[PDB]
């Protein structure tokens, strides 16, 4: 990929831009998503190459396709036109029923189950990091915080998304498949809230902790709440069997948390019985 053939179309949200890769200047070229670093440091760059290597190594239906690179390093990916699942849910909620939410849920599990075989830990599972390809397919769209497990350990030690974090991630900075399972439970909760603003994991947890709590105190109070089995409530209209999956993902006992395999099967069964 050559920088002079990447035509700027728009800012998507380092930074992510929508470009046209048109080498033979005529607009026939394909529209791609381009990720680049804003405040490019030696440390920020070294993790970005690991992210590029992680994406290149991934070949799955529910994982955003790697296309190539561009050198001032730029990661070139396929363009998914409906944006993040977080935005798509807010926008088209009217055409999204519980069967559709479970179809998305299932796809997220399948993509996560695949990451697991590569011994990769996502660390940032949230609806904002899930992209919509079309009305029937979603993909994990960002791998910026993804880590590779040490060959001999089942975990890894590292601004963080605290309201999606497992207790051991908050207390010990320990990231594993089980902490990705914990976050999947938050993703499932987000889906069944349909991203109703007041019902988001930060909004709910803050109410439970006290909206008076500030900065450094919030984390300790969140750690305490989770330890005293305080949990996100059941979203309105959320089927009890779906809430039981969430609560099982939110087990304080890391080893008692379900596998992405079992989760996809359970979600697929509920979906069929619906
Ligand atoms: C409004 C909108 C419409 S399409 C789209 C999009 N598409 C995209 C991003 N990538 C990496 C591939 N296609 N990415 C983004 N934003 C970027 C930051 C993005 N990248 C990855 C992700 F998981 C979620 N969002 N917004 C939109």
UniProtKB/Swiss-Prot annotation:
The chain holds residues 844 to 1130 of 1132 of the full protein. Interacts with EPOR, LYN, SIRPA, SH2B1 and TEC. Interacts with IL23R. Interacts with SKB1. Interacts with STAM2. Interacts with IFNGR2 (via intracellular domain). Interacts with LEPR (Isoform B). Interacts with HSP90AB1; promotes functional activation in a heat shock-dependent manner. Interacts with STRA6. Interacts with RHEX; this interaction occurs in a erythropoietin (EPO)-dependent manner. Interacts with ASB2; the interaction targets JAK2 for Notch-induced proteasomal degradation. Interacts with MPL/TPOR. Non-receptor tyrosine kinase involved in various processes such as cell growth, development, differentiation or histone modifications. Mediates essential signaling events in both innate and adaptive immunity. In the cytoplasm, plays a pivotal role in signal transduction via its association with type I receptors such as growth hormone (GHR), prolactin (PRLR), leptin (LEPR), erythropoietin (EPOR), thrombopoietin receptor (MPL/TPOR); or type II receptors including IFN-alpha, IFN-beta, IFN-gamma and multiple interleukins. Changing residue 35 to E: Loss of ability to up-regulate potassium voltage-gated channel activity of KCNA3. Residues 6-268 form the Protein kinase domain. The modification Phosphotyrosine is found at residues 21, 114, 120, 155-156. Ubiquitously expressed throughout most tissues. ATP binds at residue 35. The active site is at residue 124. This is Tyrosine-protein kinase JAK2. It is found in: Endomembrane system; Cytoplasm; Nucleus. It is linked to Chromosomal aberrations involving JAK2 are found in both chronic and acute forms of eosinophilic, lymphoblastic and myeloid leukemia. Translocation t(8;9)(p22;p24) with PCM1 links the protein kinase domain of JAK2 to the major portion of PCM1. Translocation t(9;12)(p24;p13) with ETV6. Budd-Chiari syndrome: A syndrome caused by obstruction of hepatic venous outflow involving either the hepatic veins or the terminal segment of the inferior vena cava. Obstructions are generally caused by thrombosis and lead to hepatic congestion and ischemic necrosis. Clinical manifestations observed in the majority of patients include hepatomegaly, right upper quadrant pain and abdominal ascites. Autophosphorylated, leading to regulate its activity. Autophosphorylation on Tyr-21, Tyr-114 and Tyr-120 in response to growth hormone (GH) are required for maximal kinase activity. Also phosphorylated by TEC. Phosphorylated on tyrosine residues in response to interferon gamma signaling. Phosphorylated on tyrosine residues in response to a signaling cascade that is activated by increased cellular retinol. Possesses 2 protein kinase domains. The second one probably contains the catalytic domain, while the presence of slight differences suggest a different role for protein kinase 1. Belongs to the protein kinase superfamily. Tyr protein kinase family. JAK subfamily. The lineage of its organism: Eukaryota, Metazoa, Chordata, Craniata, Vertebrata. It comes from Homo sapiens.
């Amino acid at each position: 990929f050559e920088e002079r053939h990447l035509k700027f179309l728009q800012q998507l949200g380092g930074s992510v831009e929508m470009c046209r890769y048109d080498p033979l200047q005529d607009n026939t070229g394909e529209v791609v998503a381009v990720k680049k670093l804003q405040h490019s440091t030696e440390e920020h760059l070294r993790d970005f190459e690991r992210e590029i290597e992680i994406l290149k190594s991934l070949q799955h239906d529910n994982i955003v396709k790697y296309k190539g690179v561009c050198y001032n390093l730029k990661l070139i990916m396929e363009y998914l036109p409906y944006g993040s699942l977080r935005d798509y849910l807010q926008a088209h909620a009217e055409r999204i029923d519980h069967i559709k939410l479970l179809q998305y849920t299932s796809q997220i599990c399948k993509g996560m189950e695949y990451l697991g075989t590569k011994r990769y830990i996502h660390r940032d599972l949230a609806t904002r990091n899930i992209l919509v390809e079309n009305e029937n397919r979603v993909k994990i769209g960002d791998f910026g915080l993804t880590k590779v497990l040490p060959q001999d350990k089942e975990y890894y030690k590292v601004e963080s998304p605290i309201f999606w974090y497992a207790p051991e991630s908050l207390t010990e900075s320990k990231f594993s498949v089980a902490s990705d399972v914990w976050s999947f439970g938050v993703v499932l909760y987000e889906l069944f809230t349909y991203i109703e603003k007041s019902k988001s994991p930060p909004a709910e947890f803050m109410r439970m902790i006290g909206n008076d709590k500030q900065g450094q105190m919030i984390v300790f109070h969140l750690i305490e709440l989770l330890k005293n089995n305080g949990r996100l409530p059941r979203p309105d209209g959320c089927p009890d069997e779906i809430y039981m999956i969430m609560t099982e993902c939110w087990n304080n006992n890391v080893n008692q948390r379900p596998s992405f395999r079992d989760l996809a099967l359970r979600v697929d069964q509920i979906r069929d019985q619906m």
